[PDB]
Protein backbone atom coordinates (compact mmCIF):
# COMPACT_ATOMS: atom_id res chain seq x y z
CA UNK A 1 0.00 0.00 0.00
CA UNK A 2 0.99 3.61 -0.76
CA UNK A 3 2.12 5.95 2.05
CA UNK A 4 -0.96 8.10 1.28
CA UNK A 5 -3.26 5.07 1.22
CA UNK A 6 -2.00 3.84 4.61
CA UNK A 7 -2.56 7.32 6.08
CA UNK A 8 -6.07 7.58 4.62
CA UNK A 9 -6.69 4.15 6.17
CA UNK A 10 -5.50 5.33 9.54
CA UNK A 11 -7.41 8.67 9.37
CA UNK A 12 -10.66 6.85 8.55
CA UNK A 13 -10.03 3.83 10.77
CA UNK A 14 -12.96 2.44 12.79
CA UNK A 15 -10.52 1.10 15.34
CA UNK A 16 -8.96 4.34 16.75
CA UNK A 17 -10.02 4.88 20.42
CA UNK A 18 -11.23 8.35 19.33
CA UNK A 19 -12.31 8.52 15.72
CA UNK A 20 -10.18 10.87 13.59
CA UNK A 21 -11.68 11.14 10.09
CA UNK A 22 -11.36 13.90 7.47
CA UNK A 23 -13.53 16.31 9.49
CA UNK A 24 -11.31 15.35 12.42
CA UNK A 25 -8.22 16.52 10.56
CA UNK A 26 -9.59 20.11 10.69
CA UNK A 27 -11.45 19.69 14.05
CA UNK A 28 -8.43 18.55 16.07
CA UNK A 29 -6.00 21.42 15.43
CA UNK A 30 -8.72 24.11 15.46
CA UNK A 31 -10.26 22.93 18.77
CA UNK A 32 -6.84 22.58 20.33
CA UNK A 33 -5.85 26.13 19.29
CA UNK A 34 -9.23 27.56 20.58
CA UNK A 35 -8.90 25.62 23.85
CA UNK A 36 -5.29 26.53 24.57
CA UNK A 37 -5.85 30.21 23.85
CA UNK A 38 -9.10 30.21 25.88
CA UNK A 39 -7.41 28.70 28.97
CA UNK A 40 -4.36 30.99 28.84
CA UNK A 41 -6.52 34.08 28.19
CA UNK A 42 -9.05 33.19 30.93
CA UNK A 43 -6.16 32.89 33.44
CA UNK A 44 -3.81 35.68 32.38
CA UNK A 45 -5.13 38.09 29.73
CA UNK A 46 -4.99 41.80 30.61
CA UNK A 47 -8.04 44.03 30.32
CA UNK A 48 -9.70 44.42 26.93
CA UNK A 49 -11.24 47.57 25.43
CA UNK A 50 -14.45 45.86 24.34
CA UNK A 51 -16.46 48.96 23.53
CA UNK A 52 -13.65 50.82 21.68
CA UNK A 53 -13.87 53.72 24.23
CA UNK A 54 -10.48 53.12 25.90
CA UNK A 55 -12.29 51.67 28.92
CA UNK A 56 -10.73 48.28 29.32
CA UNK A 57 -12.70 45.50 31.02
CA UNK A 58 -10.81 42.92 33.09
CA UNK A 59 -11.78 39.29 32.27
CA UNK A 60 -8.95 37.16 33.62
CA UNK A 61 -8.41 35.46 36.98
CA UNK A 62 -4.98 37.04 37.59
CA UNK A 63 -6.44 40.48 36.94
CA UNK A 64 -9.02 40.23 39.68
CA UNK A 65 -11.77 37.85 38.52
CA UNK A 66 -13.22 34.70 39.99
CA UNK A 67 -14.82 31.79 37.99
CA UNK A 68 -18.18 33.56 37.82
CA UNK A 69 -17.01 37.07 36.80
CA UNK A 70 -14.12 36.00 34.52
CA UNK A 71 -14.40 35.94 30.73
CA UNK A 72 -12.49 36.21 27.50
CA UNK A 73 -13.80 39.63 26.54
CA UNK A 74 -15.05 40.45 22.96
CA UNK A 75 -12.82 42.36 20.55
CA UNK A 76 -12.94 46.19 20.37
CA UNK A 77 -15.84 48.08 18.86
CA UNK A 78 -13.16 50.12 16.95
CA UNK A 79 -12.40 46.84 15.07
CA UNK A 80 -16.01 46.15 14.20
CA UNK A 81 -16.22 43.17 11.83
CA UNK A 82 -12.63 43.62 10.73
CA UNK A 83 -10.56 40.47 10.78
CA UNK A 84 -7.99 40.92 13.58
CA UNK A 85 -5.48 38.04 13.65
CA UNK A 86 -2.31 38.29 15.73
CA UNK A 87 -0.25 39.44 12.69
CA UNK A 88 -2.46 42.44 12.03
CA UNK A 89 -1.35 43.83 15.43
CA UNK A 90 1.87 45.80 15.96
CA UNK A 91 2.64 43.70 19.04
CA UNK A 92 1.03 41.11 21.33
CA UNK A 93 0.42 43.97 23.77
CA UNK A 94 -1.72 45.73 21.25
CA UNK A 95 -3.48 42.49 20.26
CA UNK A 96 -4.37 41.83 23.94
CA UNK A 97 -5.64 45.43 24.56
CA UNK A 98 -7.97 45.15 21.59
CA UNK A 99 -9.47 41.71 22.32
CA UNK A 100 -7.57 39.62 19.77
CA UNK A 101 -7.89 36.43 21.80
CA UNK A 102 -11.69 36.51 21.47
CA UNK A 103 -11.51 36.43 17.61
CA UNK A 104 -8.91 33.70 17.50
CA UNK A 105 -10.96 31.63 19.95
CA UNK A 106 -14.37 32.04 18.36
CA UNK A 107 -13.29 31.47 14.79
CA UNK A 108 -11.30 28.32 15.59
CA UNK A 109 -14.12 27.11 17.86
CA UNK A 110 -16.84 27.59 15.22
CA UNK A 111 -14.74 25.84 12.55
CA UNK A 112 -13.80 23.04 14.94
CA UNK A 113 -17.44 22.60 16.08
CA UNK A 114 -18.73 22.58 12.50
CA UNK A 115 -16.23 19.76 11.88
CA UNK A 116 -17.43 18.01 15.04
CA UNK A 117 -20.86 17.90 13.43
CA UNK A 118 -19.37 16.55 10.16
CA UNK A 119 -17.40 13.97 12.19
CA UNK A 120 -20.65 12.66 13.70
CA UNK A 121 -21.95 12.13 10.12
CA UNK A 122 -18.65 10.52 9.15
CA UNK A 123 -18.39 7.97 11.97
CA UNK A 124 -22.03 6.98 11.55
CA UNK A 125 -21.24 6.15 7.89
CA UNK A 126 -18.12 4.14 8.83
CA UNK A 127 -20.15 2.15 11.37
CA UNK A 128 -23.21 1.44 9.15
CA UNK A 129 -25.58 3.53 11.31
CA UNK A 130 -28.25 5.86 10.14
CA UNK A 131 -26.87 9.37 9.62
CA UNK A 132 -28.85 11.97 11.58
CA UNK A 133 -27.22 12.33 15.03
CA UNK A 134 -25.35 15.22 13.36
CA UNK A 135 -28.76 16.84 12.65
CA UNK A 136 -29.62 16.85 16.36
CA UNK A 137 -26.22 18.50 17.14
CA UNK A 138 -26.93 21.20 14.52
CA UNK A 139 -29.37 22.71 17.05
CA UNK A 140 -26.75 23.72 19.71
CA UNK A 141 -24.22 24.35 16.92
CA UNK A 142 -26.64 26.81 15.22
CA UNK A 143 -27.14 28.55 18.59
CA UNK A 144 -23.36 28.98 19.09
CA UNK A 145 -23.21 30.43 15.55
CA UNK A 146 -26.07 32.81 16.38
CA UNK A 147 -24.29 34.37 19.41
CA UNK A 148 -20.67 34.36 18.24
CA UNK A 149 -21.12 35.13 14.52
CA UNK A 150 -24.58 36.01 13.20
CA UNK A 151 -25.44 38.55 15.92
CA UNK A 152 -22.06 40.43 15.54
CA UNK A 153 -22.56 40.45 11.70
CA UNK A 154 -26.04 41.94 11.99
CA UNK A 155 -24.94 44.57 14.56
CA UNK A 156 -21.67 45.32 12.75
CA UNK A 157 -19.26 44.30 15.54
CA UNK A 158 -17.71 41.34 17.36
CA UNK A 159 -17.83 43.64 20.43
CA UNK A 160 -21.49 42.59 20.46
CA UNK A 161 -20.80 38.84 20.26
CA UNK A 162 -21.45 36.84 23.47
CA UNK A 163 -18.47 37.09 25.90
CA UNK A 164 -16.74 33.80 26.78
CA UNK A 165 -17.56 33.86 30.46
CA UNK A 166 -20.42 33.27 32.88
CA UNK A 167 -21.19 36.87 33.99
CA UNK A 168 -20.48 38.06 30.46
CA UNK A 169 -23.16 35.73 29.14
CA UNK A 170 -25.65 37.34 31.57
CA UNK A 171 -24.55 40.79 30.33
CA UNK A 172 -25.24 39.70 26.74
CA UNK A 173 -28.70 38.41 27.74
CA UNK A 174 -29.71 41.60 29.57
CA UNK A 175 -28.57 43.95 26.83
CA UNK A 176 -30.34 41.69 24.28
CA UNK A 177 -33.60 42.01 26.17
CA UNK A 178 -33.22 45.78 26.27
CA UNK A 179 -32.47 45.95 22.53
CA UNK A 180 -34.79 43.23 21.13
CA UNK A 181 -37.39 42.49 23.86
CA UNK A 182 -36.41 38.85 23.20
CA UNK A 183 -38.76 37.55 25.94
CA UNK A 184 -41.66 38.80 23.76
CA UNK A 185 -40.32 37.06 20.65
CA UNK A 186 -42.18 33.86 19.68
CA UNK A 187 -39.01 32.07 18.52
CA UNK A 188 -37.42 32.56 21.97
CA UNK A 189 -40.78 31.39 23.41
CA UNK A 190 -40.48 28.22 21.21
CA UNK A 191 -36.84 27.88 22.49
CA UNK A 192 -38.17 27.89 26.06
CA UNK A 193 -40.91 25.34 25.22
CA UNK A 194 -38.08 23.31 23.65
CA UNK A 195 -35.76 23.30 26.62
CA UNK A 196 -38.48 23.12 29.40
CA UNK A 197 -40.25 20.45 27.29
CA UNK A 198 -36.90 18.70 26.65
CA UNK A 199 -36.25 18.58 30.42
CA UNK A 200 -39.86 17.45 31.17
CA UNK A 201 -39.71 14.63 28.53
CA UNK A 202 -36.20 13.67 29.70
CA UNK A 203 -37.52 13.19 33.29
CA UNK A 204 -40.68 11.54 31.98
CA UNK A 205 -38.91 8.99 29.76
CA UNK A 206 -36.33 8.21 32.43
CA UNK A 207 -38.98 7.72 35.12
CA UNK A 208 -41.21 5.55 32.83
CA UNK A 209 -38.38 3.20 31.79
CA UNK A 210 -36.98 3.08 35.33
CA UNK A 211 -40.56 2.36 36.63
CA UNK A 212 -40.83 -0.75 34.43
CA UNK A 213 -37.44 -2.44 34.77
CA UNK A 214 -37.77 -6.24 34.86
CA UNK A 215 -36.73 -7.77 38.25
CA UNK A 216 -33.25 -9.29 37.73
CA UNK A 217 -31.49 -8.34 40.97
CA UNK A 218 -31.90 -8.81 44.77
CA UNK A 219 -32.70 -5.98 47.28
CA UNK A 220 -29.05 -5.45 48.26
CA UNK A 221 -27.94 -4.88 44.62
CA UNK A 222 -28.31 -1.88 42.35
CA UNK A 223 -31.04 -2.68 39.77
CA UNK A 224 -28.49 -1.50 37.13
CA UNK A 225 -26.75 -4.89 37.44
CA UNK A 226 -29.95 -6.45 35.97
CA UNK A 227 -28.88 -5.21 32.50
CA UNK A 228 -25.71 -6.53 30.75
CA UNK A 229 -24.12 -4.42 28.00
CA UNK A 230 -25.13 -5.93 24.65
CA UNK A 231 -27.85 -8.29 25.83
CA UNK A 232 -30.44 -9.05 23.14
CA UNK A 233 -33.63 -8.72 25.23
CA UNK A 234 -35.19 -5.37 26.22
CA UNK A 235 -34.50 -4.62 29.91
CA UNK A 236 -37.93 -3.09 30.74
CA UNK A 237 -41.57 -3.84 29.96
CA UNK A 238 -42.78 -1.08 27.51
CA UNK A 239 -46.31 -2.53 27.68
CA UNK A 240 -46.37 -1.95 31.47
CA UNK A 241 -44.79 1.50 30.91
CA UNK A 242 -47.58 2.33 28.39
CA UNK A 243 -50.29 0.83 30.65
CA UNK A 244 -49.23 3.25 33.39
CA UNK A 245 -48.85 6.39 31.17
CA UNK A 246 -51.99 5.71 29.09
CA UNK A 247 -53.99 5.65 32.33
CA UNK A 248 -52.11 8.65 33.78
CA UNK A 249 -53.36 10.85 30.94
CA UNK A 250 -55.58 8.75 28.61
CA UNK A 251 -54.61 5.77 26.44
CA UNK A 252 -54.10 7.74 23.18
CA UNK A 253 -51.69 10.24 24.87
CA UNK A 254 -49.14 7.45 25.42
CA UNK A 255 -46.51 5.99 23.04
CA UNK A 256 -46.24 2.20 22.79
CA UNK A 257 -44.11 2.47 19.65
CA UNK A 258 -40.61 2.98 21.00
CA UNK A 259 -39.39 4.29 17.61
CA UNK A 260 -42.08 7.04 17.54
CA UNK A 261 -41.32 7.77 21.20
CA UNK A 262 -37.56 8.20 20.56
CA UNK A 263 -38.22 10.25 17.46
CA UNK A 264 -40.40 12.60 19.57
CA UNK A 265 -37.64 12.92 22.23
CA UNK A 266 -35.22 13.93 19.45
CA UNK A 267 -37.51 16.25 17.56
CA UNK A 268 -39.11 18.30 20.38
CA UNK A 269 -35.94 19.85 21.95
CA UNK A 270 -34.11 19.91 18.58
CA UNK A 271 -36.84 21.86 16.73
CA UNK A 272 -37.39 24.21 19.74
CA UNK A 273 -33.65 24.90 19.93
CA UNK A 274 -33.52 25.55 16.13
CA UNK A 275 -36.13 28.15 16.73
CA UNK A 276 -34.15 29.64 19.68
CA UNK A 277 -31.13 29.91 17.33
CA UNK A 278 -33.27 31.51 14.63
CA UNK A 279 -34.58 33.98 17.25
CA UNK A 280 -31.07 35.27 17.95
CA UNK A 281 -30.20 35.06 14.22
CA UNK A 282 -33.20 37.17 13.12
CA UNK A 283 -33.10 39.61 16.07
CA UNK A 284 -29.56 39.98 14.62
CA UNK A 285 -31.22 41.96 11.79
CA UNK A 286 -33.45 43.77 14.30
CA UNK A 287 -36.77 42.12 13.65
CA UNK A 288 -37.63 42.17 17.31
CA UNK A 289 -40.02 40.79 19.89
CA UNK A 290 -43.71 41.85 19.98
CA UNK A 291 -44.15 45.51 21.03
CA UNK A 292 -47.44 46.16 22.85
CA UNK A 293 -46.22 49.33 24.57
CA UNK A 294 -49.33 51.58 25.09
CA UNK A 295 -51.41 49.10 23.04
CA UNK A 296 -54.34 49.53 25.43
CA UNK A 297 -56.05 52.96 25.52
CA UNK A 298 -59.21 54.15 27.36
CA UNK A 299 -62.23 56.08 25.97
CA UNK A 300 -60.43 59.41 26.52
CA UNK A 301 -57.04 58.35 25.17
CA UNK A 302 -55.35 57.62 28.55
CA UNK A 303 -52.83 54.77 28.27
CA UNK A 304 -53.98 51.83 30.45
CA UNK A 305 -50.74 49.92 31.20
CA UNK A 306 -50.54 46.15 30.82
CA UNK A 307 -47.74 43.76 31.86
CA UNK A 308 -46.14 44.62 28.51
CA UNK A 309 -45.69 48.21 29.71
CA UNK A 310 -44.10 46.96 32.96
CA UNK A 311 -41.66 44.87 30.90
CA UNK A 312 -40.98 48.02 28.93
CA UNK A 313 -40.03 49.88 32.11
CA UNK A 314 -37.50 47.17 33.05
CA UNK A 315 -36.11 47.21 29.49
CA UNK A 316 -35.68 51.00 29.68
CA UNK A 317 -33.56 50.63 32.84
CA UNK A 318 -31.27 48.20 31.01
CA UNK A 319 -31.16 50.38 27.92
CA UNK A 320 -30.24 53.67 29.58
CA UNK A 321 -27.54 52.11 31.79
CA UNK A 322 -25.70 49.74 29.45
CA UNK A 323 -22.34 50.86 28.09
CA UNK A 324 -22.86 54.09 30.02
CA UNK A 325 -19.95 56.00 28.29
CA UNK A 326 -20.42 54.71 24.70
CA UNK A 327 -23.38 56.65 23.26
CA UNK A 328 -23.15 60.33 22.22
CA UNK A 329 -26.37 60.50 20.22
CA UNK A 330 -29.96 59.82 21.35
CA UNK A 331 -30.75 56.52 19.59
CA UNK A 332 -28.97 53.24 20.05
CA UNK A 333 -29.14 52.10 16.40
CA UNK A 334 -26.82 49.10 16.74
CA UNK B 1 -25.07 75.00 13.25
CA UNK B 2 -25.25 75.95 16.98
CA UNK B 3 -21.58 76.89 16.98
CA UNK B 4 -19.81 73.60 17.95
CA UNK B 5 -16.31 73.11 16.66
CA UNK B 6 -16.93 69.45 15.78
CA UNK B 7 -13.31 68.59 14.92
CA UNK B 8 -11.95 69.67 18.31
CA UNK B 9 -14.92 68.48 20.51
CA UNK B 10 -13.54 65.83 22.94
CA UNK B 11 -16.37 63.41 24.12
CA UNK B 12 -16.68 61.87 27.62
CA UNK B 13 -14.24 59.02 26.89
CA UNK B 14 -11.52 61.15 25.42
CA UNK B 15 -12.36 60.13 21.85
CA UNK B 16 -13.93 62.79 19.61
CA UNK B 17 -17.65 63.28 20.21
CA UNK B 18 -18.39 63.67 16.44
CA UNK B 19 -15.17 62.70 14.74
CA UNK B 20 -12.34 60.30 15.55
CA UNK B 21 -9.79 58.07 13.79
CA UNK B 22 -10.36 54.47 12.57
CA UNK B 23 -7.54 52.03 13.63
CA UNK B 24 -5.70 52.87 10.41
CA UNK B 25 -6.07 56.66 10.84
CA UNK B 26 -8.97 57.64 8.57
CA UNK B 27 -11.24 60.32 9.99
CA UNK B 28 -14.60 58.73 10.76
CA UNK B 29 -17.72 59.52 12.78
CA UNK B 30 -17.56 58.98 16.55
CA UNK B 31 -19.76 57.39 19.19
CA UNK B 32 -20.84 53.71 18.69
CA UNK B 33 -20.90 54.24 14.94
CA UNK B 34 -17.05 53.95 14.93
CA UNK B 35 -17.88 50.25 14.05
CA UNK B 36 -19.60 51.41 10.85
CA UNK B 37 -16.80 53.47 9.27
CA UNK B 38 -16.64 51.06 6.27
CA UNK B 39 -20.06 52.37 5.28
CA UNK B 40 -20.23 54.27 1.93
CA UNK B 41 -23.25 56.05 0.51
CA UNK B 42 -23.85 58.84 -2.03
CA UNK B 43 -25.13 61.41 0.55
CA UNK B 44 -21.85 61.06 2.50
CA UNK B 45 -18.98 60.58 -0.05
CA UNK B 46 -18.97 64.32 -0.98
CA UNK B 47 -17.61 64.91 2.55
CA UNK B 48 -14.84 62.35 2.19
CA UNK B 49 -11.31 63.01 0.99
CA UNK B 50 -8.06 61.07 0.85
CA UNK B 51 -7.79 61.26 4.72
CA UNK B 52 -11.40 60.29 5.38
CA UNK B 53 -13.99 62.78 6.38
CA UNK B 54 -12.74 66.26 5.51
CA UNK B 55 -13.23 68.87 8.27
CA UNK B 56 -13.32 71.79 5.74
CA UNK B 57 -16.01 70.14 3.63
CA UNK B 58 -17.92 69.37 6.84
CA UNK B 59 -17.59 73.03 7.91
CA UNK B 60 -18.45 74.61 4.53
CA UNK B 61 -20.04 72.21 2.07
CA UNK B 62 -22.93 70.24 3.66
CA UNK B 63 -26.01 70.83 1.54
CA UNK B 64 -29.61 70.79 2.79
CA UNK B 65 -30.25 67.65 0.67
CA UNK B 66 -27.54 65.85 2.70
CA UNK B 67 -29.15 67.09 5.91
CA UNK B 68 -32.56 65.86 4.73
CA UNK B 69 -31.19 62.45 3.69
CA UNK B 70 -29.34 61.93 7.01
CA UNK B 71 -32.50 62.80 9.02
CA UNK B 72 -34.62 60.52 6.85
CA UNK B 73 -32.13 57.61 7.17
CA UNK B 74 -31.58 58.05 10.92
CA UNK B 75 -35.35 57.91 11.43
CA UNK B 76 -35.77 54.86 9.15
CA UNK B 77 -33.03 52.72 10.74
CA UNK B 78 -33.91 49.03 10.22
CA UNK B 79 -35.07 48.32 13.81
CA UNK B 80 -38.61 47.43 14.71
CA UNK B 81 -40.87 44.81 16.26
CA UNK B 82 -42.47 41.68 14.79
CA UNK B 83 -45.84 43.48 14.78
CA UNK B 84 -44.22 46.35 12.77
CA UNK B 85 -43.75 49.02 15.48
CA UNK B 86 -40.79 50.87 14.15
CA UNK B 87 -38.02 52.01 16.46
CA UNK B 88 -36.00 50.59 19.36
CA UNK B 89 -37.58 47.86 21.53
CA UNK B 90 -38.69 50.38 24.15
CA UNK B 91 -40.46 52.58 21.56
CA UNK B 92 -44.15 53.38 22.13
CA UNK B 93 -46.73 52.46 19.45
CA UNK B 94 -47.18 55.11 16.73
CA UNK B 95 -44.97 54.38 13.75
CA UNK B 96 -45.86 51.33 11.61
CA UNK B 97 -42.41 50.39 10.18
CA UNK B 98 -40.15 47.40 9.68
CA UNK B 99 -37.48 47.96 7.01
CA UNK B 100 -37.67 45.77 3.89
CA UNK B 101 -34.00 45.06 4.58
CA UNK B 102 -34.90 43.45 7.94
CA UNK B 103 -37.70 41.49 6.28
CA UNK B 104 -35.48 40.20 3.50
CA UNK B 105 -32.42 39.44 5.71
CA UNK B 106 -34.40 37.59 8.42
CA UNK B 107 -36.48 35.53 5.97
CA UNK B 108 -33.41 34.47 4.02
CA UNK B 109 -31.38 33.61 7.06
CA UNK B 110 -34.21 31.36 8.28
CA UNK B 111 -34.55 29.75 4.84
CA UNK B 112 -30.80 29.38 4.33
CA UNK B 113 -30.53 27.73 7.77
CA UNK B 114 -33.29 25.17 7.22
CA UNK B 115 -31.73 24.47 3.79
CA UNK B 116 -28.42 23.61 5.43
CA UNK B 117 -30.32 21.22 7.69
CA UNK B 118 -32.08 19.76 4.57
CA UNK B 119 -28.63 19.41 3.00
CA UNK B 120 -27.29 17.46 5.97
CA UNK B 121 -30.48 15.35 6.18
CA UNK B 122 -30.45 14.36 2.48
CA UNK B 123 -26.68 14.04 2.12
CA UNK B 124 -26.49 11.73 5.12
CA UNK B 125 -29.50 9.76 3.85
CA UNK B 126 -28.16 9.44 0.28
CA UNK B 127 -24.86 8.06 1.62
CA UNK B 128 -26.67 5.61 3.91
CA UNK B 129 -29.07 4.51 1.08
CA UNK B 130 -26.33 4.11 -1.56
CA UNK B 131 -24.41 1.93 0.96
CA UNK B 132 -27.56 -0.06 1.84
CA UNK B 133 -28.11 0.77 5.55
CA UNK B 134 -30.58 3.64 5.45
CA UNK B 135 -33.28 1.32 6.96
CA UNK B 136 -31.15 0.26 9.95
CA UNK B 137 -28.46 -2.23 11.00
CA UNK B 138 -28.63 -5.84 9.72
CA UNK B 139 -29.07 -7.86 12.93
CA UNK B 140 -27.43 -10.88 11.29
CA UNK B 141 -24.55 -8.76 10.10
CA UNK B 142 -23.88 -5.88 12.54
CA UNK B 143 -20.65 -4.16 11.43
CA UNK B 144 -19.51 -3.19 14.96
CA UNK B 145 -19.77 -6.81 16.18
CA UNK B 146 -17.00 -7.65 13.69
CA UNK B 147 -14.64 -4.86 14.82
CA UNK B 148 -12.01 -5.23 17.54
CA UNK B 149 -12.83 -3.76 20.98
CA UNK B 150 -11.65 -0.17 21.51
CA UNK B 151 -10.14 -1.23 24.81
CA UNK C 1 -16.93 10.68 19.11
CA UNK C 2 -17.08 12.05 22.67
CA UNK C 3 -14.68 9.76 24.61
CA UNK C 4 -17.37 8.24 26.85
CA UNK C 5 -20.65 6.48 26.23
CA UNK C 6 -23.40 4.82 28.21
CA UNK C 7 -23.02 0.99 28.35
CA UNK C 8 -25.85 0.42 30.82
CA UNK C 9 -29.42 1.17 29.64
CA UNK C 10 -30.82 1.18 33.15
CA UNK C 11 -28.26 3.71 34.35
CA UNK C 12 -28.93 5.77 31.18
CA UNK C 13 -32.65 6.04 32.04
CA UNK C 14 -32.13 6.68 35.71
CA UNK C 15 -29.70 9.51 34.82
CA UNK C 16 -32.42 11.04 32.56
CA UNK C 17 -34.65 11.19 35.60
CA UNK C 18 -31.86 12.38 37.91
CA UNK C 19 -30.57 15.36 35.88
CA UNK C 20 -33.61 17.64 35.32
CA UNK C 21 -35.26 16.57 38.61
CA UNK C 22 -32.13 17.56 40.61
CA UNK C 23 -31.80 20.83 38.67
CA UNK C 24 -35.32 21.94 39.46
CA UNK C 25 -34.85 21.04 43.14
CA UNK C 26 -31.70 23.17 43.33
CA UNK C 27 -33.45 26.16 41.69
CA UNK C 28 -36.23 25.86 44.32
CA UNK C 29 -33.68 26.11 47.18
CA UNK C 30 -32.34 29.35 45.68
CA UNK C 31 -35.84 30.82 45.47
CA UNK C 32 -36.44 29.91 49.19
CA UNK C 33 -33.36 32.13 49.91
CA UNK C 34 -34.77 34.95 47.72
CA UNK C 35 -38.04 34.77 49.81
CA UNK C 36 -35.80 36.38 52.52
CA UNK C 37 -33.76 38.55 50.13
CA UNK C 38 -30.92 36.14 50.92
CA UNK C 39 -29.40 36.73 47.50
CA UNK C 40 -26.11 35.99 45.77
CA UNK C 41 -26.19 39.68 44.86
CA UNK C 42 -22.53 40.69 45.28
CA UNK C 43 -18.93 39.52 45.49
CA UNK C 44 -17.52 41.57 48.36
CA UNK C 45 -13.92 41.42 47.08
CA UNK C 46 -15.12 42.84 43.70
CA UNK C 47 -16.85 45.75 45.44
CA UNK C 48 -13.92 46.61 47.71
CA UNK C 49 -11.57 46.70 44.68
CA UNK C 50 -14.00 48.62 42.45
CA UNK C 51 -14.77 51.24 45.17
CA UNK C 52 -11.04 51.96 45.69
CA UNK C 53 -10.00 51.62 42.05
CA UNK C 54 -12.08 53.55 39.48
CA UNK C 55 -10.26 51.84 36.52
CA UNK C 56 -11.22 48.30 37.68
CA UNK C 57 -14.18 46.91 35.71
CA UNK C 58 -15.54 43.41 35.09
CA UNK C 59 -18.69 41.95 33.60
CA UNK C 60 -19.97 41.58 37.20
CA UNK C 61 -19.80 45.38 37.87
CA UNK C 62 -21.30 46.01 34.38
CA UNK C 63 -24.37 43.85 35.32
CA UNK C 64 -24.98 45.64 38.58
CA UNK C 65 -25.26 48.97 36.66
CA UNK C 66 -27.88 47.28 34.50
CA UNK C 67 -29.70 46.09 37.67
CA UNK C 68 -29.66 49.58 39.16
CA UNK C 69 -31.26 50.80 35.93
CA UNK C 70 -33.90 48.12 36.13
CA UNK C 71 -34.83 48.97 39.77
CA UNK C 72 -35.04 52.76 39.27
CA UNK C 73 -36.92 52.63 35.95
CA UNK C 74 -39.30 49.84 36.78
CA UNK C 75 -40.12 50.36 40.48
CA UNK C 76 -42.60 53.34 40.31
CA UNK C 77 -45.05 51.54 37.89
CA UNK C 78 -44.23 48.01 39.15
CA UNK C 79 -44.74 48.83 42.91
CA UNK C 80 -47.61 51.40 42.84
CA UNK C 81 -48.38 51.00 46.59
CA UNK C 82 -44.98 52.62 47.28
CA UNK C 83 -46.07 55.85 45.58
CA UNK C 84 -42.58 56.42 44.23
CA UNK C 85 -41.85 59.74 42.57
CA UNK C 86 -38.32 59.71 41.17
CA UNK C 87 -37.56 63.17 39.62
CA UNK C 88 -35.92 62.92 36.20
CA UNK C 89 -32.70 64.19 37.67
CA UNK C 90 -32.30 61.21 40.10
CA UNK C 91 -32.69 58.45 37.45
CA UNK C 92 -29.44 56.58 36.74
CA UNK C 93 -28.66 56.93 33.02
CA UNK C 94 -25.54 56.62 30.92
CA UNK C 95 -24.56 59.27 28.37
CA UNK C 96 -27.19 60.34 25.80
CA UNK C 97 -29.60 57.45 26.33
CA UNK D 1 -8.41 40.96 46.05
CA UNK D 2 -9.71 40.98 49.60
CA UNK D 3 -11.31 37.57 49.58
CA UNK D 4 -12.70 35.79 52.63
CA UNK D 5 -9.82 34.22 54.53
CA UNK D 6 -11.89 31.02 55.12
CA UNK D 7 -12.64 30.57 51.41
CA UNK D 8 -9.46 28.50 50.85
CA UNK D 9 -9.99 26.02 53.66
CA UNK D 10 -13.72 25.78 52.83
CA UNK D 11 -12.97 25.00 49.17
CA UNK D 12 -10.23 22.53 50.08
CA UNK D 13 -12.29 20.55 52.54
CA UNK D 14 -15.30 20.73 50.19
CA UNK D 15 -13.18 19.00 47.58
CA UNK D 16 -11.18 16.70 49.78
CA UNK D 17 -13.68 15.16 52.19
CA UNK D 18 -16.19 13.76 49.69
CA UNK D 19 -13.48 12.87 47.13
CA UNK D 20 -11.66 10.87 49.80
CA UNK D 21 -14.93 9.16 50.76
CA UNK D 22 -15.34 7.99 47.12
CA UNK D 23 -11.69 6.96 46.79
CA UNK D 24 -11.94 4.86 49.98
CA UNK D 25 -15.04 3.11 48.62
CA UNK D 26 -13.61 2.55 45.14
CA UNK D 27 -10.27 1.04 46.32
CA UNK D 28 -11.89 -1.34 48.78
CA UNK D 29 -14.28 -2.47 46.03
CA UNK D 30 -11.26 -3.23 43.74
CA UNK D 31 -9.49 -5.20 46.47
CA UNK D 32 -12.51 -7.49 47.00
CA UNK D 33 -12.02 -11.09 45.77
CA UNK D 34 -12.73 -10.90 42.02
Amino acid sequence: ANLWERFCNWVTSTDNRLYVGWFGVIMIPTLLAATICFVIAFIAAPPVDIDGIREPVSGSLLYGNNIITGAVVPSSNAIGLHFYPIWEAASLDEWLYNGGPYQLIIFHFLLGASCYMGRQWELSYRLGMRPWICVAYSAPLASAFAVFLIYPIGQGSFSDGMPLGISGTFNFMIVFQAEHNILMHPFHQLGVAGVFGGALFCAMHGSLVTSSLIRETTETESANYGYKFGQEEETYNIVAAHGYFGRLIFQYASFNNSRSLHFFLAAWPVVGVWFAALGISTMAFNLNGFNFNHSVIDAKGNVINTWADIINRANLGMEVMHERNAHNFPLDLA
Amino acid sequence: KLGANVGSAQGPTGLGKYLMRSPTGEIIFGGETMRFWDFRGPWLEPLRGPNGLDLNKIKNDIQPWQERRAAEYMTHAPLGSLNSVGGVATEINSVNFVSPRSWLATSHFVLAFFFLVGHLWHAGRARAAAAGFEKGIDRESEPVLSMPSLD
Amino acid sequence: IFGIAFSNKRWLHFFMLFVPVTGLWMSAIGVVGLALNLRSYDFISQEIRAAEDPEFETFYTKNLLLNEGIRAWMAPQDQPHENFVFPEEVLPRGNAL
Amino acid sequence: MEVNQLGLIATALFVLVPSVFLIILYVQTESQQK
Binding site: L61, N66, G230 | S149 | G3, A5 | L8, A12
Partner: peptide, 30 residues
Amino acid sequence: METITYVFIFACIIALFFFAIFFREPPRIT
Protein backbone atom coordinates in the same frame (compact mmCIF):
# COMPACT_ATOMS: atom_id res chain seq x y z
CA MET E 1 -4.39 32.01 46.48
CA GLU E 2 -7.84 32.22 44.83
CA THR E 3 -6.41 32.01 41.34
CA ILE E 4 -4.31 28.96 42.33
CA THR E 5 -7.45 27.38 43.77
CA TYR E 6 -9.56 27.92 40.65
CA VAL E 7 -6.80 26.70 38.29
CA PHE E 8 -6.07 23.68 40.54
CA ILE E 9 -9.71 22.58 40.47
CA PHE E 10 -9.87 23.09 36.72
CA ALA E 11 -6.63 21.11 36.21
CA CYS E 12 -8.01 18.26 38.30
CA ILE E 13 -11.13 18.18 36.13
CA ILE E 14 -9.03 17.89 32.92
CA ALA E 15 -7.01 15.05 34.61
CA LEU E 16 -10.33 13.35 35.41
CA PHE E 17 -11.44 13.60 31.74
CA PHE E 18 -8.20 11.82 30.74
CA PHE E 19 -8.68 8.93 33.21
CA ALA E 20 -12.44 8.65 32.49
CA ILE E 21 -11.79 8.26 28.74
CA PHE E 22 -8.50 6.30 28.57
CA PHE E 23 -8.73 4.37 31.85
CA ARG E 24 -12.44 3.70 31.76
CA GLU E 25 -13.96 0.38 32.85
CA PRO E 26 -14.04 -1.22 29.35
CA PRO E 27 -17.46 -2.09 27.88
CA ARG E 28 -17.61 -5.92 27.49
CA ILE E 29 -20.37 -8.03 25.88
CA THR E 30 -20.90 -11.16 28.05
